[PDB]
Structure formats: structure tokens, C-alpha cells
């Protein structure tokens, strides 16, 4: 079965306007500040520890959805590549976050909340 | 200004490599996805970018001939894709309505001609 944590953030980025706040958004000053050593090196962390775990397939596949689903409502609101592609992967390991119950996560505390309270997570 | 946001090499990847790009740096030529539906055409690309190249953030873990083959072996079955190669600033324009795969060969070329290979 997918997840239900899944289908909650499914409900959150199909959410009218949900990626909005994009409009408003300093793309070059945001990206610059995410390749930055404090948020890459913590990105990658988040990413590396997450890419050592198993998760199941109907899980993976359902991920992959919503990866599609943030980067393409993105990609409607300010045309931006990198930026659509950033909110994929930050999905990607939000989703695996929540599906392992991770505590003090920082996907989930920072970038997750970062989109729920209308932001670029940088 | 017209902004794709497609570096190719992406700009996190080409940090610290003979061809690193600054974000202020609107000369630099990017990808723009032609055709209808271009949400369709960068999700395509991305998604083949993530398979091959990996996560946006981070090193890319490889040399530089490593980083451009990765582009290439990310878009070998793109070929039903146009893009035009163009700098945002409109100061060069390198192909038009050209394939992904073509696009790396035209940058590359560029990159050599600038003495930033």
C-alpha cells in the first residue's frame, strides 16, 4: 500500500496555488545560497544517509509521482528549470523522509516546511 | 533577459571546473525546450539528468570528460526533444530547434572556442 504520509503531501502540492509563491521568488540569490557549502553539505547528507535505505516499490513508484507532480506545477508558475528540478529532488527526500518516521529531520523541519508556509526552502 | 534556468553542465556541477559558470553571468548559453508542452520536455530532462548525473546538489563525483559524457548518455533517447541554445542575454545563439544531444556537441564547441575547456 502507498503510504498515507504520501498521499498527504499529494493533497499539498495539488493544492490551488500551492506553488505561487514562486512569483516572488530571487532566483539566482536562492540557488546561489543552496549550492553554498552550509545547505549543500546538508542536503547531501540528508541525501546520502536516506540513499542508504530500503524502501518499498509502491512507495518508490508513488515518489516518483510526486516528484513529477512538483516539478511540472513548478514549471507552470515561473518557467524555471533548475528551480523546478531542485523542488523535485527536495520532494524526493522529503517523501523517504516521512516514510521512515524520520525525527528532527531536516527535510522535513526546513525544506517540507519551508513549501507548506509558501517558500523556497534555501 | 530570458531565463530557461538549463545550464548544461548544470552550474552545481561545473563549480570548480575550467568551464564554472556564476549565476550573474547571463552570456553563458542555456537550453530553452521548444515545441508544446515544455513542462513535459524539462521534466524529461531532468528526470534523465537525476538517473545519470544524480541529485542537483552536490560534487559531481567524476572528470570533466566524465560530466559531459554523463549529459550525453542521459539524452541518447531524447532525440524527439527540440531545444535552442542561446545565451539569455541574446549575445550568442548556438543552435535552433536542435536535440538535446545535439545541444551538448554546440556547447562544448563553445566552451573550447572561449578557452574554457
Given at each position: 500500500?502507498?503510504?498515507?504520509?504520501?498521499?498527504?503531501?499529494?493533497?499539498?502540492?495539488?493544492?490551488?496555488?500551492?506553488?505561487?509563491?514562486?512569483?516572488?521568488?530571487?532566483?539566482?540569490?536562492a540557488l546561489?545560497?543552496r549550492?553554498?557549502?552550509?545547505?549543500?553539505?546538508?542536503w547531501?547528507?540528508?541525501?546520502?544517509?536516506?540513499?542508504?535505505?530500503?524502501?518499498?516499490?509502491?512507495?518508490?513508484?508513488?515518489?516518483?509521482?510526486?516528484?513529477?507532480?512538483?516539478?511540472?506545477?513548478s514549471?507552470?508558475?515561473?518557467?524555471n528549470?533548475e528551480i523546478s528540478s531542485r523542488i523535485s529532488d527536495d520532494?524526493?527526500?522529503?517523501?523517504?523522509?516521512?516514510?521512515?518516521?524520520?525525527?528532527?529531520?531536516?527535510?522535513?523541519?526546513?525544506?517540507?516546511?519551508?513549501?507548506?508556509?509558501?517558500?523556497f526552502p534555501? | 533577459?530570458?531565463?530557461?534556468?538549463?545550464?548544461?553542465?548544470?552550474?552545481r556541477?561545473?563549480?570548480?571546473?575550467?568551464?564554472?559558470?556564476?549565476?550573474?553571468?547571463?552570456?553563458?548559453?542555456?537550453?530553452?525546450?521548444?515545441?508544446?508542452?515544455?513542462?513535459?520536455?524539462?521534466?524529461?530532462?531532468?528526470?534523465?539528468?537525476?538517473?545519470?548525473?544524480?541529485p542537483r546538489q552536490?560534487?559531481?563525483?567524476?572528470?570533466?570528460?566524465?560530466?559531459?559524457?554523463?549529459?550525453?548518455?542521459?539524452?541518447?533517447?531524447?532525440?524527439?526533444?527540440?531545444?535552442?541554445?542561446?545565451?539569455?542575454?541574446?549575445?550568442?545563439?548556438?543552435?535552433?530547434?536542435?536535440?538535446?544531444?545535439?545541444?551538448?556537441?554546440?556547447?562544448?564547441?563553445?566552451?573550447?572556442?572561449?578557452?574554457?575547456?
Amino acid at each position: 500500500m502507498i503510504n498515507n504520509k504520501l498521499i498527504e503531501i499529494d493533497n499539498c502540492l495539488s493544492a490551488p496555488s500551492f506553488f505561487d509563491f514562486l512569483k516572488s521568488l530571487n532566483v539566482d540569490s536562492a540557488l546561489d545560497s543552496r549550492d553554498e557549502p552550509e545547505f549543500d553539505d546538508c542536503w547531501m547528507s540528508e541525501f546520502n544517509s536516506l540513499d542508504k535505505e530500503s524502501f518499498q516499490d509502491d512507495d518508490i513508484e508513488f515518489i516518483d509521482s510526486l516528484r513529477e507532480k512538483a516539478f511540472k506545477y513548478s514549471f507552470r508558475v515561473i518557467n524555471n528549470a533548475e528551480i523546478s528540478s531542485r523542488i523535485s529532488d527536495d520532494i524526493e527526500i522529503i517523501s523517504k523522509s516521512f516514510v521512515l518516521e524520520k525525527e528532527n529531520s531536516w527535510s522535513i523541519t526546513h525544506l517540507w516546511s519551508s513549501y507548506k508556509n509558501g517558500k523556497f526552502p534555501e | 533577459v530570458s531565463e530557461s534556468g538549463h545550464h548544461v553542465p548544470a552550474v552545481r556541477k561545473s563549480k570548480g571546473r575550467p568551464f564554472e559558470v556564476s549565476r550573474f553571468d547571463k552570456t553563458r548559453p542555456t537550453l530553452f525546450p521548444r515545441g508544446e508542452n515544455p513542462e513535459h520536455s524539462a521534466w524529461r530532462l531532468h528526470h534523465a539528468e537525476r538517473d545519470v548525473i544524480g541529485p542537483r546538489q552536490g560534487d559531481f563525483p567524476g572528470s570533466d570528460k566524465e560530466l559531459f559524457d554523463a549529459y550525453r548518455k542521459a539524452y541518447s533517447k531524447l532525440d524527439d526533444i527540440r531545444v535552442d541554445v542561446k545565451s539569455p542575454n541574446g549575445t550568442y545563439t548556438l543552435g535552433t530547434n536542435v536535440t538535446p544531444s545535439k545541444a551538448v556537441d554546440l556547447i562544448e564547441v563553445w566552451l573550447k572556442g572561449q578557452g574554457l575547456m
